[PDB]
Amino acid sequence: SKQPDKQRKSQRRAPLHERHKQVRATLSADLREEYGVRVNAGDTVEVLRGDFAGEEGEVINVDLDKAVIHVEDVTLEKTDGEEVPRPLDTSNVRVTDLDLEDEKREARLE
Amino acid sequence: KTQEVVSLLEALDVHADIDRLFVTS
Amino acid sequence: PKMKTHKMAKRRIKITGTGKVMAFKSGKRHQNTGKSGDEIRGKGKGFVLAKAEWARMKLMLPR
RNA sequence: GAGCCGGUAGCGGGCGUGGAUCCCUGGAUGUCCGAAUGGGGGAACCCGGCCGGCGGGAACGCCGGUCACCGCGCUUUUGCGCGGGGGGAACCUGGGGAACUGAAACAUCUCAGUACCCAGAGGAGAGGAAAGAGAAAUCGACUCCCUGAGUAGCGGCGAGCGAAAGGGGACCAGCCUAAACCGUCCGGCUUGUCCGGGCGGGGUCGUGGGGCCCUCGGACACCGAAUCCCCAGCCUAGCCGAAGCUGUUGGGAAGCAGCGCCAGAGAGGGUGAAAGCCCCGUAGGCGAAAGGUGGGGGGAUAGGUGAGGGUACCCGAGUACCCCGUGGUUCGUGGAGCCAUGGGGGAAUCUGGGCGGACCACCGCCUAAGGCUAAGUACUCCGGGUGACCGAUAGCGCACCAGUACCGUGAGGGAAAGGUGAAAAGAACCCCGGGAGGGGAGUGAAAUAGAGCCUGAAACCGUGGGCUUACAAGCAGUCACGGCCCCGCAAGGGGUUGUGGCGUGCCUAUUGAAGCAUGAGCCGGCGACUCACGGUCGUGGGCGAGCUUAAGCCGUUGAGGCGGAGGCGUAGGGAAACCGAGUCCGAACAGGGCGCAAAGUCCGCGGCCGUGGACCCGAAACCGGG
RNA sequence: GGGGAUGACCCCAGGCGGUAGGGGAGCGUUCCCGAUGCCGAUGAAGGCCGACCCGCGAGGCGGCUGGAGGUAAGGGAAGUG
RNA sequence: GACCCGGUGAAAUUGAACUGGCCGUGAAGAUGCGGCCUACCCGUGGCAGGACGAAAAGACCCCGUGGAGCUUUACUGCAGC
């Protein structure tokens, strides 16, 4: 990690969990100001960019794999028809309703 | 402290300052 | 790096800072010449011009 | 730390916070070939002994396991139990060991102890405490840098080849062994007194050892390894980890605009178009191990050497030395030595014996004819960084189903092919059609972005228009004028041409060139006077005495600084002795060299020259291993 | 050569065909400076066309193209034409 | 077979070309230089003469103090005797 490429190298060649590193982000008021450690991968979010900028949505599939995630909102319909989930670019994921009814969720980040 | 720097800075800022070269002795 | 036909440097060949050079008369003698006396009065130094250039040069550095 | 059954997207079915996928290390399996070694053998396949379960052996019988090549010592016994080998891109040393080419031929020679082939050790080997050096009575491992010297000099003295002690620097360290003398003894001859070999004595550093007599004297000296846990370094992932939102043109914004913060971390990348504050597991920095490798550093382990005089002396080699015939060396047979040896002679053990280049006298130097010795220089398979390095015809030839596709019998040769998109949302359905492929519809920021689908120019083929075309030469054309057509830079140009004037292409190499001499069919990309060290003259400029090595230290940026062996000017004349602004010839005041400062010197850029493959490609051929 | 302010202007003299070849001076090309240098989604580049600048090798500029750059008013560098 | 039909659909050489005969000319055997004479625009089946036609950077030549095979009382050496 001292050159532009070792980034990819460690990032996805080493811990997929590093990809979780990718998971990293932030959220609403409460939680966020509250602090900034430990998360939920699958939590609620709003997209702060793209036409979909400022759009209300929920995180369903934490998809560190393809290096991003899927939220019910950020979705598009096909051409044949059927509607389906959009490839969501980590980059503008704002979490807020901090998924926590899950005791463990609470324990870890709120 | 670098904020202290902030300080001496307030003391004599300028574009020449922008130039700015750090020398101790 | 570099050198001199160290040879001509040695047989005949030397420079006075003038940037010029001499070698021995060499007109006969030191081989045949039952020849003479006054001619023998012919072996102090010879100063060949212009050419004393490939000369000088090739020697360049030391002498 | 919460997703996963790899690159395959798909189906069909599944695992995991009663720390899954995966990162690491340390595990068992580990089919068959390949030193192959159990035997054979066109590898990757076919053959053999014991244990092996006992296996179906339904009222009938296995694989599996296993197991043994040979060179190596030696506990010899009947030999049991050790080491080897097979690799390896380049690096090392030794064994062996070449033509071209330069000398403008070519026999010496150079290319070189170069290429190659070989054996072998390593992680580095090389080598390495002196029969040295040199000579100031001085120096002291071996190696590697600079310097010394392109000197001293080797030489059809022709091309060329060309050192070393000393100074500077990095590094630093030292130890044995036969070496019979002693004793120990074993085993012998055959008892003595002989050699013999396992034990110590010594087991030599700069000469002593041993053996005799008295002085001894009575504890800090660890190498190359041995040892502890040490920071054991690393081994991959370790983890924290500062700080803006609202507006807004936008298909998108991180952008314009408003105001808000960070900050020893305004290194860079990823983010739908360029953000310090959005992602970044980055620089700020802290971080961290139960495994697998150190120096340091600590200890004992510690091995291990460590004083005095005497005495008739016994104590590291089988050959030095010499003569012939070769080697290294700078030495090309030479006035020609030192070491190393091929072949014959065949010494001396301290007044021994080589040495200082023929030799002789005296001096000075060293102590051979055994062994080990980390570190200071080389090298790159591999990991990291960094680049006035490259951008797919450039980089390694290969940026990803390439040393493979393919000609080769074989050894061997050896391509080309990257990019759509922001992400597929990749194109249902409808339409002609055998279909592909074409039209609609939907994505959409565009799809004349549409799947070999970015930017996709030229060559060249098409489809529409303007003009122009049948008594006419020429590439070409271009100067004039006219007719018709367009006037987004209008009373002037645009394109086209009927006529008319004058008019032999282009490039190489040529006395001379349309050329019928060459060159070249078209367009697009590659493509040829450079670098390095010398030297040189020009000059820009820093002192005139001017100037720098190797190195040591300082280093986001990472900053240059300090180093004073040396080498070029400071007179030179000579062959030299040597003298010297004089100096050689000579014995004569006659000339040649010089004196005459006019002074350089370093660095920078530049015309050039020498060695370099060195303006570029171009053959026959000689040589090496296959 | 006669003054030149830096240009430049003027007079005359005074030529100015040119290969090997020798001397001066410019041009664009991808790079390193960003010598108290930064343009661009209302386009970086390259492309596609042109009756203002240069003696010129080139400039500028306007139009259409296309998706992402990269320039450097000045010196430095070279796999340059 | 050629020729006409339908299906298929290369190749060397090539600057480029809308390329006459003449008599002359030039480097000396010219379609494109001069004066002149015929001469309409295109094509396919043909005939070979010219385009010094193609193929090949003469192998006959000479030149480079070029190469490789063989020869003897050429030089020098090595082998084996």
Strand-strand pairing, C14-16 and C20-24: antiparallel
Range of the domain at A43: 1-110
Strand-strand pairing, A55-63 and A75-77: unpaired
Q: Cα separation of A46 and A26, whole Å?
A: 11
Question: Which CA distances in Å does B23 have to A58, B5, B20?
Answer: 55, 13, 10
The bases of strand D with some atom under 7 A from any protein CB are 1-4, 17, 20-23, 150-151, 153-155, 157-162, 236-243, 250-254, 263-265, 267-272, 275, 278-282, 384-386, 423-428, 441-444, 533-536, 568, 570, 572-575, 585, 591-595, 610
Q: Cα separation of A96 and A50, whole Å?
A: 18
Q: What is the CATH number of the domain that holds A10?
A: 2.30.30.30
Could you tell me the distance in Å between the CA of residue B8 and the C1' of nucleotide E74?
Answer: 35
Closest residue to D559 (CA, C1′)? B23
Q: Helices (H) and strands (E) in chain A — how many of each?
A: 4, 6
Instruction: Name, in order, each residue with C-beta under 8 angstroms of C11's C-beta and a sequence gap of 6 or more.
Output: C23
Which method, experimentally, gave rise to this model?
X-ray
Q: Cα separation of A8 and C23, whole Å?
A: 77
Quickly count: other Cβ atoms within 10 Å of residue A45's Cβ: 27
Q: Cα separation of A73 and A91, whole Å?
A: 16
Quickly count: other Cβ atoms within 10 Å of residue A39's Cβ: 22
Nucleotide nearest the Cα atom of B19 (by C1'): E36
- State how many domains chain A has: 1
Q: Cα separation of A85 and A96, whole Å?
A: 20
Closest residue to D254 (CA, C1′)? A49
Give the residue carrying structure tokens 């202290």.
B4
Residue A76 has phi, psi (to 5 degrees) of: -140, 155
> Interface partners of A (3+ CB pairs, < 8 Å)?
none
Instruction: Give the experimental resolution in Å.
Output: 5.5
Q: Cα separation of A45 and A94, whole Å?
A: 5
